[PDB]
């Protein structure tokens, strides 16, 4: 019942899990170790992945989990930010509940402050991204997304992602109707051993499987014919019935000798057309590997059927459900097929040079630690996901991050509090206080004192200027310090900012996340 503080118990249960997400965002934050049910330690910065592995029967927590999926799917950033904003709205609302304020004015107060905040976001944009897609220009948007994970490696990993995005985007001008970037077209590989400086950017899909045959790689001639066969290699049979059975020993000689002549006849018809590569998605027999060595055909196997759909858009080959029909219309062309040593093992690399432009790219990564390669691999997928948000719907607009905008918006929210009469004055003032948790967590995770960073941010953004036009610098953020002497510095010097499409979309998600929790005054479940 409400006399026992049921609305407080729902907040207290989330407040105990609120401190977990407070240490997620930021490079100086902390990570949580979660043991998977398969007996493997999995750790990552992104909260949307950890919430899926954690089993929580609390429906109030699931409200923030479902709101987190909106930041993970529709956007490439803001998964850790929505958990901090929605979690703080429940704590600041305890002051209004203790005073006897109904949940109507609390929800109505956030709705009125939501339209006031979203309207001011258009004036917070100073510069606009021209979408040049240049290698140096893409480093501005990609760096803050790759940041707050594996601090210190953001300088080298910035050139790997920025180069892969330019390869996926085709060359076009004055056309915004047709989409270009694809999320699933970029696959990242990891191999133990090596160093970070040995990484590079290659156009294609790197195959780590063994060549399985005496032919390691093809020649240097352009447009290698590649055939993708879905049906496994076996003796030619009849589509109707055609079941092989054992009855008399006389048929045993025809079974062994029959498979040698039929398989050799099918490989001869394919080699006559000039096909130098055969891709078999299923298992390959032993007798098939002996004939491909004399014909000079590269052996390649792809056990994963998910990569066969994306392979058709790269080389141009088509899968054939039958076997023995080398249709020329289903054959692809690739310029370069070689074999290089990646991570200490010999692997066959699949790439190209100029012709047959493909949208599939692969970022090769190396490292000694296996757990560190998991976060870097997932950071690239979250880094390239922000490219989708660079399109016409406010993709060029930007706002200063790292605590610069959250402190500056406080002065604008408090100004509208006394301007709007009625009971909404209490909800507007508490709406700006809930934004003070973002700069506070950045100072705690960085080792800085709470009494230091907070008063310095207010004095930096609040000055007396005899004039209407604002002066000095409004870009002052939360500095990590740990260097130089004292004070903060301009965040624009490091080219770190929060994209407006990430911040504006996160406000609507954060308000609706805390609205559902505050609107539910009673819960009923069963023992499980």
């Amino acid at each position: 019942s409400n006399a026992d503080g049921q609305i407080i118990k729902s907040i207290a249960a989330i407040r105990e899990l609120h401190q977990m997400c407070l240490t997620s965002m930021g490079p100086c934050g902390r990570n949580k170790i979660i043991v998977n049910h398969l007996g493997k330690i999995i750790i990552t910065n992104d909260a949307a992945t950890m919430l899926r592995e954690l089993d929580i029967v609390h429906p109030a927590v699931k409200v923030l989990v479902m709101a987190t999926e909106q930041q993970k799917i529709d956007m490439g950033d803001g998964t850790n930010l929505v958990m901090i904003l929605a979690g703080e709205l429940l704590n600041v609302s305890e002051k209004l509940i203790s005073m006897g304020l109904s949940a109507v004015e609390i929800i109505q107060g956030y709705n009125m402050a939501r339209k006031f905040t979203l309207k001011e976001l258009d004036e917070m944009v100073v510069g606009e991204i021209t979408d040049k897609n240049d290698k140096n220009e893409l480093l501005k948007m990609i760096k803050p997304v790759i940041s707050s994970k594996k601090y210190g490696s953001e300088d080298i990993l910035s050139e790997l992602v920025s180069e892969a995005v330019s390869h996926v985007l085709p060359v076009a001008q004055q056309a915004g109707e047709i989409p270009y970037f694809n999320v699933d077209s970029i696959r990242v590989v990891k191999i133990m051993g090596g160093s970070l400086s040995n990484s590079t950017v290659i156009k294609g899909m790197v195959f780590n499987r063994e060549p399985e045959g005496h032919v390691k790689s093809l020649s240097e001639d352009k447009k290698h014919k590649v055939a993708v066969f879905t049906c496994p290699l076996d003796i030619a049979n009849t589509e109707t019935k055609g079941t092989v059975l054992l009855h008399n020993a006389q048929e045993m000689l025809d079974f062994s000798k029959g498979e040698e002549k039929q398989i050799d006849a099918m490989m001869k018809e394919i080699a006559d057309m000039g096909v130098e590569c055969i891709v078999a998605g299923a298992g390959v027999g032993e007798l098939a590997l002996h004939y491909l060595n004399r014909y000079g055909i590269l052996v390649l196997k792809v056990p994963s059927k998910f990569e066969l759909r994306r392979l058709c858009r790269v080389c141009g080959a088509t899968p054939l459900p039958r076997l023995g029909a080398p249709t020329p219309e289903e054959l692809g062309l690739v310029e370069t097929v070689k074999t290089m040593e990646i991570g200490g093992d010999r692997v066959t690399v699949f790439k190209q040079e100029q012709g047959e432009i493909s949208r599939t790219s692969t970022i090769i990564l190396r490292g000694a630690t296996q757990n560190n390669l998991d976060d870097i691999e997932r950071a690239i997928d979250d880094g390239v996901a922000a490219v989708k948000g660079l399109m016409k719907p406010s993709g060029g607009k930007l706002l200063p991050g790292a605590g610069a905008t959250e402190i500056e918006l406080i002065s604008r929210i408090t100004k509208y509090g006394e301007r709007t009469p009625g009971l909404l004055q209490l909800a507007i003032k508490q709406f700006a206080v809930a934004f003070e948790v973002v700069p506070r967590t950045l100072a705690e995770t960085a080792g800085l004192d709470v009494n230091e960073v907070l008063p310095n941010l207010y004095a930096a953004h609040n000055v007396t200027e005899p004039g209407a036009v604002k002066t000095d610098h409004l870009y002052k953020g939360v500095d990590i310090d740990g260097e130089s002497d004292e004070g903060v510095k301009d965040i624009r010097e490091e080219n770190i900012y929060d994209m407006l499409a990430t911040k504006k979309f996160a406000i609507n998600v954060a308000t609706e996340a805390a609205t559902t929790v505050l609107s539910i005054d009673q819960i009923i479940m069963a023992k499980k």
Binding site: N31, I33, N36, D55, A446, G482
Partner: protein
């Protein structure tokens, strides 16, 4: 902060097991695997691999040891002790209010300054005041000192240096040199073998033949079983005729005679396989001077392919004539009431074998592992020309320089770097305690001459005293000291960065 403190004791518990195993004179730990097999070793790698600790931070110290054993292979024990020592130094800092984030930040600046000092202490020297043969011989006597073999170490160094020189200096591996234990006999009578040798577990008949003197025997690999015996399957054949009872026992001898005839036409004088060879063939091979040995391990058969360049064929039909190989000379010794088979004079052999003799099997096991520590010093001498002074020399100076550089640094990083410099004192400590010397007296006496400006002063492992390891011939490569500070810091940064431990059962 409660789970962080729990992770501190988890690292000390794992570190405590590796403390007595640090150093050549250190104690050995006994671990009983679930397989009920007794395993005793002082190498931290194998020790941590057999524990299989469910604790996430304790497993991190195990995973980082595998990376130290892969890229390098030396220092797997010291990298965990150094990594876990930072957990104890950072324990009182958490209660005082100092966050572990600034503590992890001070380590990145301390190691960056420590690696620069390692290259300054590494001096490349090859032909200066040293010869070609005496260079690797003086390095083997370092690991053999203060051991039961010190009296016989004069004869053991000659066999150790010849094992490395018998292989290409560009590619060297400790797994390429085979060692077989010979029970019984004198220790000083051991000899070195250029080829490959196995245990010869075949106990069956057919002795007194196949003498130890061969001219040019032909080696051929074997896959299937040459004997006609069928161990598993069978059949039921019965006739009702009286006179046919004789002829129904007489048949099967002809079956494999067809395939066995092709073996005689090849002329292979050596028969080896991963399966036990039947006793049927042990006679006629003596007439043709063909040698055969059964019950050979699978690991010893891989060295035969790399020796004479042989190949494994399934049947006796398609065997090619060029797959055969021959050695210069054969030798077989009956010492120890057991015959031992070994090959000699193989110019194409990529491996060798060193036989060891002693009074007991447990005595030789301590001699074999004491040699492995000397092999790594001889192997890394020719591979890497940059070496640093070990045995307390380098370890004490890295902690000294950080004390002076911390004076110019202001803020919490001063006491953090000083804590990292103090954490470096655990390495020389355990080396003295495991060797019997008092770690308290040496710690005070070593810091005396350490402040006189000379950075090469080490700790004598034979007689307790302070001095320079340059006369003790204690050499260590620079790649181990550099990668130890990076692997210990990276493993420590992952444990201190996790406040909450979550484990889901499935």
């Amino acid at each position: 902060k409660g789970q962080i403190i729990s992770n501190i004791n988890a690292c000390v518990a794992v570190q405590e097991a590796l403390k007595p195993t640090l150093g050549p004179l250190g104690s050995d730990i006994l671990i009983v695997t679930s397989n009920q097999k007794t395993t005793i070793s002082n190498d931290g790698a194998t020790i941590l691999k057999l524990l299989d600790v469910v604790h996430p931070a304790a497993k991190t110290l195990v995973d980082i040891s595998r990376a130290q054993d892969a890229e390098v292979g030396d220092g797997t024990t010291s990298v965990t002790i150094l990594a876990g020592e930072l957990m104890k130094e950072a324990k009182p800092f958490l209660e005082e209010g100092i966050s572990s984030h600034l503590i992890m930040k001070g380590y990145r600046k301390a190691v960056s300054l420590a690696v620069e000092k390692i290259n300054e202490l590494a001096v490349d020297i090859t032909s200066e005041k040293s010869s070609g043969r005496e260079l690797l011989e003086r390095c083997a006597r370092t690991a053999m000192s203060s051991k039961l073999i010190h009296n016989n170490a004069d004869f053991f160094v000659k066999m150790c240096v010849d094992a490395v020189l018998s292989l290409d200096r560009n590619d060297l591996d400790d797994k390429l040199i085979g060692i077989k234990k010979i029970p019984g006999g004198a220790m000083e009578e051991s000899l070195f073998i250029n080829g490959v040798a196995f245990k010869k577990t075949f106990s069956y008949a057919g002795f007194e033949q196949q003498p130890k003197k061969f001219n040019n025997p032909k080696i051929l690999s074997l896959n299937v079983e040459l004997e006609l015996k069928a161990e598993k399957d069978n059949a039921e054949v019965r006739v009702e005729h009286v006179e046919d009872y004789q002829a129904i026992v007489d048949a099967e001898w002809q079956l494999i005679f067809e395939k066995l005839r092709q073996v005689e036409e090849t002329g292979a004088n050596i028969v080896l396989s991963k399966l036990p060879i039947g006793d049927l063939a042990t006679q006629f091979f003596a007439d043709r001077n063909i040698f055969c040995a059964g019950r050979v391990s699978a690991d010893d058969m891989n060295r035969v392919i790399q020796a004479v360049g042989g190949s494994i064929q399934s049947t006796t039909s398609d065997i090619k004539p060029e797959h055969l190989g021959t050695c210069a000379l054969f030798e077989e010794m009956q010492i120890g009431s057991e015959r031992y088979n070994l090959f000699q004079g193989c110019p194409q052999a990529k491996t060798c074998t060193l036989l060891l003799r002693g009074g007991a099997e447990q005595v030789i096991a301590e001699v074999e592992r004491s040699l492995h520590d000397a092999i790594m010093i001889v192997k890394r001498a020719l591979q890497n020309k940059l070496i640093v002074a070990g045995g307390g020399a380098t370890e004490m100076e890295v902690s000294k320089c950080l004390r002076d550089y911390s004076k110019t640094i202001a803020g919490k990083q001063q006491m953090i770097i000083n804590a990292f410099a103090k954490a470096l004192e655990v390495i020389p400590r355990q080396l003295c305690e495991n060797a019997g010397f008092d770690a308290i007296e040496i710690l005070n006496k070593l810091r005396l001459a350490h402040s006189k400006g000379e950075k090469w002063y080490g700790v004598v492992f034979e007689t307790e005293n302070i001095g320079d390891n340059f006369a003790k011939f204690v050499w260590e490569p620079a790649l181990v000291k550099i990668n130890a500070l990076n692997s210990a810091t990276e493993a420590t940064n992952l444990i201190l960065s996790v406040d909450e431990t979550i484990t889901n059962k499935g």
